[model samples]
Target chain A: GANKTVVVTTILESPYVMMKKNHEMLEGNERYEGYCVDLAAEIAKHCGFKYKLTIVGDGKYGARDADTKIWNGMVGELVYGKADIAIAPLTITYVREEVIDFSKPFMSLGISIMIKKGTPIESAEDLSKQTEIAYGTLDSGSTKEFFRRSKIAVFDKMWTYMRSAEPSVFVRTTAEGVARVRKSKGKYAYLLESTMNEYIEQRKPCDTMKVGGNLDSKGYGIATPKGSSLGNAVNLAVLKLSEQGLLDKLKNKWWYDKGECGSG
Target chain B: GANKTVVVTTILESPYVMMKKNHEMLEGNERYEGYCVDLAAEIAKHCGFKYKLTIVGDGKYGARDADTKIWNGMVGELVYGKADIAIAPLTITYVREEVIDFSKPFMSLGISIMIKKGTPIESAEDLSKQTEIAYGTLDSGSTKEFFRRSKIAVFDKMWTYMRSAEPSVFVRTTAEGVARVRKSKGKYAYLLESTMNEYIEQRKPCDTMKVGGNLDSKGYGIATPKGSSLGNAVNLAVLKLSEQGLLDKLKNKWWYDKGECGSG
Candidate 1:
């Protein structure tokens, strides 16, 4: 096992894992780069493992099929032994925790409101009360699940609208949601994780803003199959990296230092 | 095991757990009440278990002996099988997670500053650069461990001062820490969990206030021994209660509704 190259499953979401500018000229691990890419290298170094980063074939964070009871995306890869680990922005959620093990969180984030700058809305409460502005989350992920399962008055109300709204508010990917916000001219707002929302706000145009406080709090963890031997060492490595300030450094390197827009 | 009552370990902390006013006339679970008490009942009802509540003998949150490697407090109760579960403001730290299983956080909190009203300090950075005002955390707990292990320059400098400060800035209990702030004439500040700091802010006299953004983010979790049979059900129950807004209702009932300070 020591000599075996571990398979690391991740997604193509920007600032986490994305194609390098010259990806066409590259092969293997060098084909991709972002926050999680550097994170994967650090994790492998500390845990003494050789790993190959692979994008999930289905291009999903991960979720359970309600009727089929099957897992999909990066989580599925680990659950079915298609990969040895998942190093991505996959949320450390309860349903996911039941089937796999997560290291102590490497990063913390929450469902946040992303609005076109100058949009009249400031909070989820504001969105839940207004009909002029429409909002939605990336389909089939924790953000959507939060609205689906929320019993809180404001969020539950927003969910009611998003589920039945005309033209369907849900988007297939984070990019799609951001595009909708950019073009909706204040008519559509997107709900996404704060990490992604902040990253997007720092990219070119800088026409978006993460408004108000996050609606909820959670974190992203490095994940492995339920009983994988790598769980212990990887967990410790994340903690060590966090305590040593390396995680914070990595976050700055990807999110702010290299930011395309002006200073965050 | 089904017929036997599950033993629950908790701490007798204000607003989380406290003796009933008529405690002399009551017995067992009826003699105690607060946020965790209500939460414990909800979890047991949803998870289908009968349980008994017992306070930790040492009244500690839980930490390991650096040299002896022995655990203490409610966490120790679970580790040694003296209690089947721990349902208190037990923080989920990496060292503890290695030995126990924690549910998805039942409550989110972070290290925060508690300053007596009119203190000149505004943030950890403000305190780190000055010596006129003193600060410390509860000895032998996660808050202390956070500073002790921190590598972020500001926090690392603060920890250096705290670990060797004259008159021993560390307090034996949170109550002692609060009292120090109240009695130190704006000269002493306390670094504690945001939950406890907020609760204290709402108590009578209201001589202190929680200021600035939290220094770090983390959560309090329901815990069980590693490999405990009840882990899965209990974990699911926490998520259910959180989504259902019961956790919010309970926080309001215990922390705000009963607040002695006017309208927090």
Candidate 2:
């Protein structure tokens, strides 16, 4: 039995792995709520580890800081040995895969655009064809990569608009992107993952929306630093949870039954 | 010249309309940053309005309370005439539309499912057939409505699962659904908008992925109470922004650039 406590780092994104208002009053993982909290408990049980939950210091969830050549946010915590593992909504991408090992994606998602209601644009193609309708993605994430590597006719066209847009169209993170769409009042459209889009839409003053179909296919993976012994067990634990229906139960408990828009 | 300030009620979602750590150092809308901050400026310019940005009370963006038969959040602020207008990323659902008039969709998005990578599930069909993998949309929003009104075979099947799944499969919000997938490891799948899924994929510790295609199509609309004179002007302003490339610029500014994955 390992006597040392395992430190788990996460971001403060809503309804994922948020700390309870009285988290200090509770001890250990019991202080946590949300879907990830429940899943992490199962993961810890399977891996046979004792753990504590902490948020990332910088408040960023994840991204490559080009200037420093460092991975910050939750990914940073794991890569730097700041934590034993990360149970946030970490994404599986080629860049992160090089530095850390990710368990099989527990979920799959892709990049799409969020726009205020009543814009003339419909699909990426529509946005691309018109020079007046500028479009872009987060500054240095998977969505940016999509435009960078795309060969499709429309995506290629979209790249032209994205690469050359003025004031450099790109957000620091997904949450900002959704907010831009809302405040922009149909003047701005954010291209980000579908997961955050739906969550924001569920919220009030809900001015933003995702448009068109996703332009790519990718999955989320449980991440561990390279050569960590926990990778396989975590992956297997994920699979087992999926099979047990416990995963489904947790999803309902967190996603369906909570939030400002809930029926209750 | 008229000396009047339009109070725009918004939420404090990150990277969008967050209060600056040094907001006091900044003046007026200049204090705001991210997509919404920029968009709000453009909207004010295009619509010929002078505005002061204010955050919503209770920190709930907007939603309905069934028990009270009342609405709260940013939309409520507008409905109760506490705020003159709402230009946030609100959805154009039937329930919400009943209380507020919305501009035409500035963007389009749809509800879809997120599953762990390598799961047997590929589409709603896969989810419908599997007993272990249950699926549902954010409750009381467009995704739920899609399932409720679905006439398609696959969605109809999904509707059955959502309606009767044990532990109640429906999620109250999109954030809850996403958390479930992240925590469940690959056991639970989430149903949400395409934009959010793409954003989550870009974040660190990214483990969730979107699965299947979108189940329904709808757009986020700029909402105002029915018969509000601002509806026509706001709709026109939205279309104008779309044409001026301001919308496209804002989209690129917030989302497209941050992603690292190449668009497929």
Candidate 3:
């Protein structure tokens, strides 16, 4: 083996990237579990590259600082050349796409509204049209931004509601929002991505269900520094894995079979 | 009062279900427009009975052959009692959900593949080990079924790849799949939702691109006959309107907005 090692920058996200409880006993990629870890292993095998998985510094995957005009977390790692590649749930957005190079979407996603089972809400329109139930979204994330940018009918109505709602319907993160819904009884509904919503649906208490479909659309992609020479090879590797069906296996391993309800 | 009419059933599809071009001509929820037309106007609201827009026959909104089980048109109209509901892009599937209904999705859709722009792929594992690419999912709908039902690792691998493919790879539909990557050439990639892929991306002289993602998943839903009581409402009102949207706004509106490269 040569000294060459591709540095893969990623974040800790459930079902995608997570520390294996038995990591200390496992070796290399085997030490990891979840969707992203599986993908990194396959990508390495296909691209003929050796990689070291490294967590992004600063904890934030990618956040825009209005004052600094810069990005942080894994995005920064790739942008700053601290990492050669990033395999995490980093969002592909207009702003980030401008500074970083992204591969075609490995997946698509959108903001979704989740409510505890038995809650009266059936759709986004119900939330917007009714008053007895209140709603909110994850703070500092795409869901909030979607409301900010929407010009469509229902979404526009939702935007108005979120902007002027009493007590201000927003949470710092998805976890916090989920917790709020669990604790709020039937009074609150949380908005987050369909992936996360679906994941939580399989968890214990299993009281939450995604409602009314998606609110907006977005996708996640592999990230590299702008002009990184490896972008081409990396993109090709993903398409191959997709064709082979490994990607689907990995998703079930994490999202459905490996959850608290699953045997994992 | 105006002459009384029949009741119409309908389902929700994009552009078709949207507010009209001359919304001023209509009042309140009466603002009907899109593919379904005449029939929608003739029934439902005009006919009386505070009707509900339920899914159609077999709880799907589309036509169904008595023998082949193939979906023909809006589910709300045929399977349900609304002989009057118009027909459009509904899909056919087995085992209808037991509650509400469908008229038919009013259009077709399936699953397709997307990849990072430069990733080389003759098969799925080709992208396995490359840190340069990651993958996961587009938002809601049938694409999720591909991973959910996959017995093979290639599909699973695709699921896993997508879960981790971040910022660079994500999309809502086939159109977005092509748009996201075409904007950057091969730098980005996508596995699009099917009907959209065929209707938009896979068409002749396709502006964006598509390859290899296949029908691991199946059919779309037009709200159909999950229940018997709401069938008439859906067929008479919902399916008819859904078709109108498909023919008019869904087709032409995007022509002007697609700018230069994409399908209109």
By lDDT, the best candidate is: 1
Model 1, position B119, has a per-residue lDDT of: 100
- In order of lDDT, best first, we have 1, 2, 3
TM-score of each: 0.92, 0.48, 0.53
Docking class of 2: incorrect
DockQ pick, better of 1 and 2? 1
Predicted candidate 3 versus true structure: per-residue lDDT over B1-264, tens digit per residue: 554333344444432344567878877446655434433433444335443333333323333354875543354344544543333333333223322344323333456655433446433455444545444444433354346445575666666666665563555443455556556545555555544444444333455444554644333333534444444344334333432233234444432344344443
TM-score top scorer: 1
Per-residue lDDT for A98-166 in model 2, tens only? 677766445546677778878777787777767665566876556776677666678778787778878
**Global CA lDDT computed for model 2:** 0.69
Query: Model 3: DockQ against the native?
Result: 0.04
Q: For candidate 1, what is the DockQ-based docking class? A: acceptable
Q: Which candidate number has the best DockQ?
A: 1
Task: List the candidate 3 regions with Cα displacement exceeding 4 Å.
Answer: A1-3, A24-31, A163-168, A259-264, B1-214, B217-264
Model 1 agreement with the true structure over A1-264: per-residue lDDT tens digits: 238999999999999999999999999999999999999999999999999999999988888899998998889999999999999998887778889988878888989999999999889999989899989999768899889877788888999999999989999899999999999999999999999999999998889999999887678999999989999899878867875678878998999998888764
Q: In model 2, what lDDT does residue A208 have? A: 63
- The TM-score of predicted model 2 comes to 0.48
